[PDB]
């Protein structure tokens, strides 16, 4: 009934009704004009002919290793290239933010309420005749059927990029500081009001929780020693709320501060490592500043760990999953002469696309043993049993599964994969093709183009009937992967903008924060600028086992 | 004890301790180097001997009415000029913010906790030997003595720029959406979590309060009719809490939603005007959008009012108090090709300097009656008796007091002025001269240079003993005014940057927001772009009396 229900405005033009049956498109700053912002201005015509496809670019980034070897060692070209990826991605994100589940137009309520996930595309209106607006049937296909036909795993498909379990659990640990859906309110509500990398999954979302996790000497976090090893403190000792089955032994009720982290020993492995790391930095910082009190040591160490995280995320984690020969660089200075907003709001679609459960293996192989999901969940005695050094060595060696390419969601998390479909619809997401347009991709013309094969394509066609009505979540996991890659085109071209905006958006990247005094001087500053996944493990894990995100 | 107590680092360098008795200066990006960042880089040398003093620039702006008469008419020149005032002012403020009452170093708590006012200069550390750090006596001069000698009004001093009571009350009403001290918590803490121009003073800080004030029809705010005139609804009807003395007879307990606006009829006057204006705009939107529901009517009207507010503050309000012949311009597009952060945090010092109580008369003259403070306070009946038309006519006609120049604080609010001195010390403000360097002004070398006269200068010199220990607040009210001006140099050079960043940093000024469709189409947009103090009054006040911020 709403005249904007068909999504008539193209190229990021905004649609507004102008009567019960009529509409208008606002083409301001789009580079186009016309009734629907489809006829381009002269300069636009030119930018367009010059613009290479995401697929062409990706080819160039994953070939010619010899040329990249050179570029990488010419600091000024490396900086030039990295500047361009940074800015070209980030300009895809609305900032300040617009739209959320309840608002398909820009209200002060949508801007000011930090309780919502923001939304890259506005929700389909409540009165549209079909779930996707105007197209398709009255009803999307039964979600159980989609799940079973194209998502559930038959045989385990390994990631051809060699992503290991260190990678999979880092992703889960790092992302769960900003994906924290508030189930009391609905999907599309978050409990992580920091809307980014604030390390609340280490220090607690609220001051109350932080103070419970704190030792209040030397800036340190509370902990216990079992065997000769440092672990998070207990729930009984700190009185912080955690989520645990009621039968779990007092000693194994680890507290840590993201309340959900005790349900997977892999999460708790990183919780322990980061806890250890905070306290290691306190020691260095105390050594450097005998004058300092507890508050300042805690607060400075926290700023340093924020930097270390972003460093690692860009130069090891994103580096790995990109498959690029170009060496990505964490360097806030790249943006000091650019237009850039040091702020971030996490999008609901970013939560959605980050559901990478295909990464999970059939069993968890902690060198020697092989645990089933049932055995693994809410079970920290495994961590105690094997210790951190083992775990690192084991997780470094076990391949994770491929994410795109279809049929690789472990049955053990089927209920989760289904909820993603259901909550997507509940939140009234626009189609896959609407999202491809939003991010400057060409809409798919058939399911067979989406998957690159024929079997899954046909199953999808019988269910959806029209490609322009295919949904975002199912499509990301079923999409044709890049040649020997973990992800398809859509995952990368939507993921990258959200990701890099969240990373560089941080206040510690702003000119006023990005200087040595912010981090306790030159010493604290180097901890950030030399941080890596290897040194994180090396410094904090008993032996000094080798790791990477790659299974070698 | 703190080695940084002397504030050694100059030119915006940051001090850090490096041991119990030593310190280091971080000169990064200051344009200076050396132990205290006082030795300028070459390009910095050129900039300095090419930079006109604030007084030179002020002179140029307040003279040559002939030339400015030409420039105001070259859209091209007006723009580039306004662009330069916006950018150079704003670069003076840290954004993202740094420091608050409790943190004289960066910290994530200082960044993330919106309950604090930010701070342009960090507090003086608790353990410093003297209140100003290292200079002056172990104690600051008795605040009663400072108050009585150089602050209290003997004879009324009228503003030479001709400010009237429309100006004074506009000031109070507008600033009180972002200055809302949380007294429960302390000075340094605010209840305006929106940190800017969000119109919470019309709509409420929380969603619970907003809903209580809302009609839920046609997007409107609840109101009552008394005689044939529209007034805010009552406390008993809306259940929204207000602050009123118990003797107030319900029925005059107007709601309005900044809970403090009952205690001055001049505040209730504007509250009434903006409430009428909101419902007026709903009528206009409804006419353009027969198909819109209540929610979008409400939200769109709110965005439009925000726009009107910003427009009026810049082109009528700031315009008047500036005394410039150059015609200021509200135009977000001026910043689209510039680096600029669309975010704000209101500074404690901004609150401090806006304590413009000298504006207030000894009696409030509403055509025919001369009301005293005791009679004016929390007394809406005066508003009901005279009406909005009378009130605008009277307020437009009565002059305000001069602010700088000393000895013009109304005796009626002497307790308030004393609290300002006392709270500044409580919040550990740095000295006047520290704040002057921070905003690129020369430190004053004697009290006599500060005041421009002799008698107060000598009074101050006996109290403070040393000019480098003079306090900021008392100084602003005692400072030598610009020629026939309302304020002295310090007020303007501090206030302008806080004010302009506060205005332009609003999300509706950002590229994605600044477009016709945000405000419901070209007619909604035009309300923003044509708004003025005169038009605000003409549309909503019975007859349509002439108004101005200037006495005629
Ligand atoms: C043993 C490993 C894992 C288990 C047991 C698990 C299970 C779960 C469960 C029960 C949920 C909540 C679903 C809901 O509340 O609707 C969830 C959500 C989620 N998962 Fe996993 N998962 C695992 C691994 C991973 C991995 C490797 C990733 C990689 C990115 C990931 C990404 C996410 C995300 C982004 C959410 C949404 C979080 C939120 O909105 O609060 N998970 N998972
Ligand atoms: C009848 C008129 C006025 C009265 C009765 C009045 C009285 C007061 C009082 C009692 C306070 C609270 C003091 C405290 O908490 O220590 C205050 C604060 C303040 N006043 Fe006024 N004042 C008036 C007009 C004005 C005007 C015209 C301005 C112009 C800017 C102004 C600026 C301020 C500011 C910025 C604060 C701080 C508010 C906060 O932090 O919440 N006042 N005033
Ligand atoms: C030749 C490769 C070096 C430059 C690196 C650019 C990497 C990211 O470039 C991306 O590619 C897409 C298609 O071109 C665009 O849609 C994106 O906006 C752009 O950010
Ligand atoms: C510097 C040399 C430039 C050569 C660019 C090679 C581009 C070929 O790249 C091809 O583009 C397609 C995109 O639609 C993809 O489907 C293919 O997988 C990809 O190989
Ligand atoms: C992973 C186990 C759960 C899914 C089985 C039930 C749904 C049936 O799904 C079918 O499974 C076949 C075998 O893979 C495919 O050949 C078909 O294309 C597919 O539709
Ligand atoms: C284009 C020519 C520029 C010259 C403008 C005149 C500058 C005078 O500026 C002077 O600066 C002093 C600063 O302390 C003030 O005390 C004076 O009041 C002020 O007149
Ligand atoms: C006369 C030239 C056009 C008018 C623009 C200047 C008005 C505001 O510019 C101000 O001037 C001061 C002195 O240089 C600086 O200290 C301020 O930082 C700057 O914002
Ligand atoms: C969250 O999911 C992703 C997926 C791919 C990404 C790729 C980049 C880099 C390589 C990019 O192409 O600019 C960054 C973040 C990414 C995040
Ligand atoms: C709160 O106090 C002030 C005082 C002077 C101001 C001057 C400007 C303009 C004219 C300017 O000088 O840039 C803006 C805000 C201002 C605020
Ligand atoms: C100039 C132009 O392209 N106008 C099109 C119109 O033909 C179409 O009916 C409408 C609905 O999608 O979209 C628009
Ligand atoms: C959201 C948040 O953390 N608010 C905190 C509040 O809890 C605390 O009372 C205050 C003083 O420490 O700082 C602020
Ligand atoms: C939630 C929290 O820990 N905050 C505490 C709170 O008890 C106190 O009233 C407030 C006053 O500043 O700050 C502190
Ligand atoms: C509840 C559950 O599955 N228990 C497991 C158990 O099977 C396993 O022997 C142990 C290893 O430490 O981890 C726990
Ligand atoms: C190189 C230099 O200027 N050193 C100065 C020193 O002379 C002075 O005692 C001190 C004042 O704070 O600051 C430092
Ligand atoms: C701080 C704030 O306004 N939070 C609001 C909350 O009250 C409301 O429940 C929710 C959904 O309307 O939007 C959010
Ligand atoms: C989704 C959600 O939490 N909705 C809330 C509602 O529970 C509450 O009654 C109201 C009060 O502000 O705010 C809104
Ligand atoms: C308690 C008090 O001061 N009452 C005043 C009264 O003096 C004045 O006549 C009346 C009408 O405007 O306003 C009220
Ligand atoms: Cl990410
Ligand atoms: Cl202002």
């Amino acid at each position: 009934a709403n005249p904007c229900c068909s999504n008539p405005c193209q190229n990021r033009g905004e649609c507004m009704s102008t009567g019960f049956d009529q509409y208008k498109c606002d083409c301001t700053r789009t580079g186009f004009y016309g009734e629907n912002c489809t006829t381009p201005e002269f300069l636009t015509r030119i930018k367009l002919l010059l613009k290479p496809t995401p697929n062409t670019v990706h080819y160039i980034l994953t070939h010619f290793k010899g040329v990249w070897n050179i570029v990488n060692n010419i600091p000024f070209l490396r900086s030039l290239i990295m500047k361009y990826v940074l800015t070209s991605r980030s300009y895809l994100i609305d900032s300040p933010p617009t739209y959320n589940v309840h608002y398909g137009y820009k209200s002060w309520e949508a801007f000011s309420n930090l309780s919502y996930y923001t939304r890259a595309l506005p929700p389909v209106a409540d009165d549209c005749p079909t779930p996707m607006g105007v197209k398709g049937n009255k009803e999307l296909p039964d979600s159980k059927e989609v799940l079973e036909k194209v998502l559930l795993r038959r045989e385990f498909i390994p990631d051809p990029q060699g992503s290991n379990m260190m990678f999979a659990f880092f992703a889960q640990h790092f992302t769960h500081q900003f994906f924290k859906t508030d189930h009391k309110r609905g999907p599309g509500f978050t409990r992580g009001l920091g809307h980014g990398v604030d390390l609340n999954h280490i220090y607690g979302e609220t001051l109350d929780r932080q103070h419970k996790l704190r030792l209040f000497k030397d800036g340190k976090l509370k902990y216990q020693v079992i065997g000769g090893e440092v672990y998070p403190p207990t729930v009984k000792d700190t009185q912080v709320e955690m989520i645990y089955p009621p039968h779990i032994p007092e000693n194994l009720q680890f507290a840590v501060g993201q309340e959900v982290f005790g349900l997977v020993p892999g999460l708790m492995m990183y919780a322990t490592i980061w806890l250890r790391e905070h306290n290691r930095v306190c020691d260095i910082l105390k050594q450097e500043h005998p004058e300092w009190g507890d508050e300042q040591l805690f607060q400075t160490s926290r700023l340093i760990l924020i930097g270390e995280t972003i460093k690692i995320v860009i130069e090891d984690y994103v580096q790995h999953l990109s498959g690029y020969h170009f060496k990505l660089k964490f360097d806030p200075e790249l943006l000091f002469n650019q237009q850039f907003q040091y702020q971030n709001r996490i999008a609901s679609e970013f939560n959605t696309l980050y559901h990478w459960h295909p990464l999970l293996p059939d069993t968890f192989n902690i060198e020697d043993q092989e645990y089933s999901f049932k055995q693994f969940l809410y079970n920290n005695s495994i961590l105690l049993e094997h210790g951190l050094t083992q775990f690192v060595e084991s997780f470094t060696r076990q391949i994770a599964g491929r994410v795109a390419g279809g049929r690789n969601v472990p049955i053990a998390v089927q209920a989760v994969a289904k909820a993603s479909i259901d909550q997507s619809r509940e939140m009234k997401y626009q189609s896959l093709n609407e999202y491809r347009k939003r991010f400057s991709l060409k809409p798919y013309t058939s399911f067979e183009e989406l998957t690159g094969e024929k079997e899954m394509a046909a199953e999808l066609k019988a269910l959806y009937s029209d490609i322009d009505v295919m949904e975002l979540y199912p499509a990301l996991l079923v999409e044709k992967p890049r040649p020997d890659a973990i992800f398809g085109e859509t995952m990368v071209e939507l993921g990258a903008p959200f990701s890099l905006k969240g990373l560089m958006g941080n206040p510690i990247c702003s000119p006023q924060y990005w200087k040595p005094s912010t981090f306790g001087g030159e010493v604290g500053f180097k901890i950030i600028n030399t941080a890596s996944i290897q040194s994180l493990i090396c410094n904090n894990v008993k032996g000094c086992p080798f790791t990477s995100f790659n299974v070698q």
Side-chain angles (χ1 to χ4, degrees), chain A:
Chain A
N2 197 321
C4 289
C5 278
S6 85
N7 297 309
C9 311
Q10 307 305 121
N11 296 306
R12 269 153 106 15
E14 320 200 335
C15 182
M16 175 189 65
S17 51
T18 52
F20 291 97
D21 296 285
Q22 321 93 248
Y23 76 84
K24 188 186 183 314
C25 298
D26 187 358
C27 302
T28 303
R29 270 161 235 123
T30 64
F32 295 73
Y33 53 95
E35 184 185 7
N36 319 303
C37 320
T38 52
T39 118
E41 299 166 346
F42 176 64
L43 217 173
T44 295
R45 260 180 180 101
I46 295 166
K47 302 184 202 288
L48 281 168
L49 296 182
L50 279 27
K51 225 92 285 185
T53 65
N55 280 341
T56 297
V57 166
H58 171 273
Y59 184 97
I60 301 171
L61 259 1
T62 57
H63 293 264
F64 317 112
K65 190 178 193 66
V67 187
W68 291 113
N69 174 20
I70 276 185
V71 164
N72 288 341
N73 289 112
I74 307 164
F76 316 77
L77 290 186
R78 190 182 174 204
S79 293
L80 195 74
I81 304 282
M82 186 72 204
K83 189 188 287 193
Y84 178 83
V85 14
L86 244 29
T87 59
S88 67
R89 297 298 194 188
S90 296
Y91 104 97
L92 276 286
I93 310 294
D94 289 345
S95 192
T98 64
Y99 316 133
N100 61 27
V101 229
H102 292 335
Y103 293 92
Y105 54 87
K106 274 150 193 172
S107 73
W108 191 261
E109 170 70 19
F111 164 77
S112 66
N113 207 314
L114 306 186
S115 267
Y116 291 86
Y117 290 111
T118 194
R119 218 101 129 20
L121 282 181
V124 174
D126 305 310
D127 55 309
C128 298
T130 69
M132 294 298 183
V134 151
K135 289 176 175 177
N137 304 317
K138 221 77 176 70
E139 246 58 55
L140 253 4
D142 173 278
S143 55
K144 179 64 56 193
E145 223 180 328
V146 176
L147 208 224
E148 297 193 321
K149 275 176 166 92
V150 299
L151 306 183
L152 288 191
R153 161 183 297 165
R154 334 293 194 180
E155 193 158 356
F156 167 80
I157 305 164
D159 165 34
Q161 280 179 236
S163 297
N164 56 25
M165 290 315 292
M166 287 298 286
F167 172 83
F169 282 123
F170 184 91
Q172 192 193 187
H173 178 87
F174 165 78
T175 66
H176 280 49
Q177 78 191 279
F178 50 72
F179 302 143
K180 306 161 70 197
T181 293
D182 188 348
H183 286 121
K184 284 57 71 199
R185 273 89 120 68
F189 291 86
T190 184
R191 291 178 311 127
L193 314 185
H195 282 275
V197 186
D198 57 13
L199 305 197
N200 77 80
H201 60 155
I202 296 167
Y203 305 104
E205 177 73 34
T206 66
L207 233 219
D208 190 24
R209 188 165 174 101
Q210 182 202 108
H211 288 7
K212 290 179 168 177
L213 292 170
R214 271 224 245 161
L215 184 63
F216 286 106
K217 300 139 229 317
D218 289 328
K220 299 197 200 291
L221 256 9
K222 278 189 189 155
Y223 64 96
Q224 59 178 336
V225 189
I226 311 178
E229 300 285 296
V230 171
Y231 295 94
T234 65
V235 156
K236 186 64 146 291
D237 177 32
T238 61
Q239 275 162 350
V240 343
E241 176 192 315
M242 295 290 296
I243 296 161
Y244 281 114
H247 60 272
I248 288 168
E250 173 171 333
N251 22 299
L252 294 170
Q253 294 184 39
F254 296 148
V256 317
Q258 224 289 32
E259 57 170 46
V260 80
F261 281 176
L263 298 177
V264 200
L267 259 15
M268 208 51 82
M269 170 191 74
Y270 276 117
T272 300
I273 285 168
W274 282 108
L275 188 140
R276 261 122 94 147
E277 171 68 7
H278 171 86
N279 285 359
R280 182 202 144 245
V281 179
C282 283
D283 288 332
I284 297 183
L285 241 28
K286 182 178 179 193
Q287 164 108 286
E288 277 299 298
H289 294 108
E291 353 62 86
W292 277 9
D294 177 76
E295 248 327 90
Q296 187 164 12
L297 284 155
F298 169 81
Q299 296 292 347
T300 309
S301 299
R302 173 170 197 175
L303 291 187
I304 287 165
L305 266 57
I306 289 176
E308 286 193 62
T309 299
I310 300 169
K311 176 73 184 187
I312 290 156
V313 162
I314 294 176
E315 306 198 0
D316 293 322
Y317 172 88
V318 162
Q319 187 64 240
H320 166 253
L321 66 71
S322 80
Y324 296 167
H325 287 136
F326 176 65
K327 256 198 315 176
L328 307 169
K329 184 187 188 192
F330 176 45
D331 177 21
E333 310 220 4
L334 297 181
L335 296 171
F336 293 173
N337 76 347
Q338 295 300 302
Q339 281 171 329
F340 190 83
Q341 298 299 312
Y342 296 98
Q343 62 177 277
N344 193 57
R345 199 89 135 244
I346 46 231
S348 173
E349 305 90 336
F350 190 36
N351 195 144
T352 292
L353 71 81
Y354 236 122
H355 285 51
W356 291 355
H357 299 107
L359 280 177
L360 291 173
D362 286 331
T363 65
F364 300 93
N365 311 148
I366 311 283
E367 243 49 310
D368 202 17
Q369 277 287 348
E370 286 187 5
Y371 307 90
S372 55
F373 272 84
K374 313 85 250 175
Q375 280 162 357
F376 206 63
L377 302 182
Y378 17 75
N379 183 18
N380 295 124
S381 65
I382 297 185
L383 188 61
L384 262 191
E385 269 272 329
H386 289 93
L388 258 295
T389 307
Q390 207 68 251
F391 249 84
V392 176
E393 295 174 349
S394 306
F395 282 175
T396 304
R397 237 137 315 279
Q398 184 178 2
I399 16 86
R402 189 177 219 171
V403 176
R407 299 172 173 169
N408 209 24
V409 171
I411 339 290
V413 300
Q414 73 176 319
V416 179
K418 183 174 184 290
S420 289
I421 307 174
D422 299 324
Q423 292 167 180
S424 254
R425 297 172 179 181
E426 177 178 337
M427 291 187 295
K428 310 298 304 302
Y429 275 27
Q430 292 182 37
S431 67
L432 168 66
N433 279 162
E434 289 304 325
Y435 281 96
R436 287 179 55 83
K437 285 192 261 173
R438 181 48 260 267
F439 287 82
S440 293
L441 309 175
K442 174 171 296 305
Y444 287 119
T445 56
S446 63
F447 296 94
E448 15 283 324
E449 191 183 14
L450 167 56
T451 74
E453 52 77 88
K454 233 329 162 292
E455 183 166 336
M456 280 189 291
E459 224 63 45
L460 284 164
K461 199 193 182 315
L463 289 166
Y464 289 89
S465 186
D466 186 349
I467 183 69
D468 285 344
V469 137
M470 179 68 188
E471 305 172 271
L472 177 66
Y473 167 74
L476 294 167
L477 302 189
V478 124
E479 177 172 57
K480 185 199 191 175
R482 260 63 176 285
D484 265 310
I486 188 156
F487 298 136
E489 180 194 17
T490 301
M491 185 71 78
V492 181
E493 297 297 290
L494 307 214
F498 291 128
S499 174
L500 301 181
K501 189 57 171 66
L503 267 7
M504 306 303 297
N506 203 273
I508 81 155
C509 301
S510 61
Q512 279 295 101
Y513 278 74
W514 190 252
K515 49 178 81 158
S517 51
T518 308
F519 310 106
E522 231 52 58
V523 63
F525 208 38
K526 303 325 103 73
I527 298 192
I528 294 169
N529 284 316
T530 71
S532 71
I533 190 77
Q534 182 63 93
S535 65
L536 184 71
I537 271 51
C538 197
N539 290 334
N540 294 294
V541 182
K542 175 67 163 307
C544 167
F546 154 99
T547 22
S548 68
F549 290 143
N550 162 73
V551 89
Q552 71 264 153

